[PDB]
Amino acid sequence: KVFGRCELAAAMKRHGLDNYRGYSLGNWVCAAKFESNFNTQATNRNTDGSTDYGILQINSRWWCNDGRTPGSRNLCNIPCSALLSSDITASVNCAKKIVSDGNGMNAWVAWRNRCKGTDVQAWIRGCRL
Ligand SMILES: [Cl-]
Ligand code: NA
Ligand SMILES: [Ru+3]
């Protein structure tokens, strides 16, 4: 599913990401924009042999099982294909664990490099939330 910007904002808000660990909704929308282009089906293989999955590009080294990532963990206790669903529940629940792990939203490289320190409120402009 390719979400609209405000469509995704409403869903993320609906699932309690606004202000989760102190990160405003616009941070999460911006992260999704630059991680996945708002596409739940996005997958990207990493140099380390892991793959990132879904709207928030969650990693098979630590967070989900894809059967092809050696020595990895599955700390969200899910097949990585769950992160590609049109229903973002699994991605959100897993993201809450990731952002709680110590480095906050720095776990998302596209957030750090493209959202952090920017006017992230812009990402929810025009949305009825
Ligand atoms: Cl933090
Ligand atoms: Na894994
Ligand atoms: Ru840790």
Q: Report domain extents, the chain.
A: 5-124
Can you tell me whether residue 45 is helix, strand or coil?
strand
Residues marked active site are found at: 35, 52
CB 42 within 8 A of CB 54: yes
CA of 64 to the centre of ligand 2 (A): 5
Q: What is the CA radius of gyration of the chain?
A: 14
Experimental method: X-ray
Strands, sheet with 58-59, edge to edge from the N-terminal-most edge strand: 43-45, 51-53, 58-59
Cα separation, 112 vs 114, in Å, equals 6
Query: What is the rounded CA–CA span in Å between residue 126 and residue 129?
Result: 9
Q: Is 101 annotated as a binding residue?
A: yes
Ligand positioned closest to the Cα atom of 103? 1
Which sign does the torsion angle of CA 32, 102, 24, 85 carry? positive
List all residues 6 or more positions away from 37 whose beta carbon is below 8 Å from its beta carbon: 2
Ligand 2 centre distance from Cα of residue 121 (Å) = 33
Sign (positive or negative) of CA dihedral 47, 52, 57, 62:
negative
The fold adopted by the segment(s) 5-124 is Lysozyme (1.10.530)
**Alpha helix ranges (H) inside the chain:** 5-14, 25-36, 89-99, 109-114
Can you list the positions of beta strands (E) in 10-92? 43-45, 51-53, 58-59
Which tokens in the block code for residue 22? Answer: 């102190």
Residue 39 DSSP one-character state: B
CA atoms within 13 A on the CB side of 114: 16
Q: Please list the alpha-helical segments (H only) found in 15-128.
A: 25-36, 89-99, 109-114
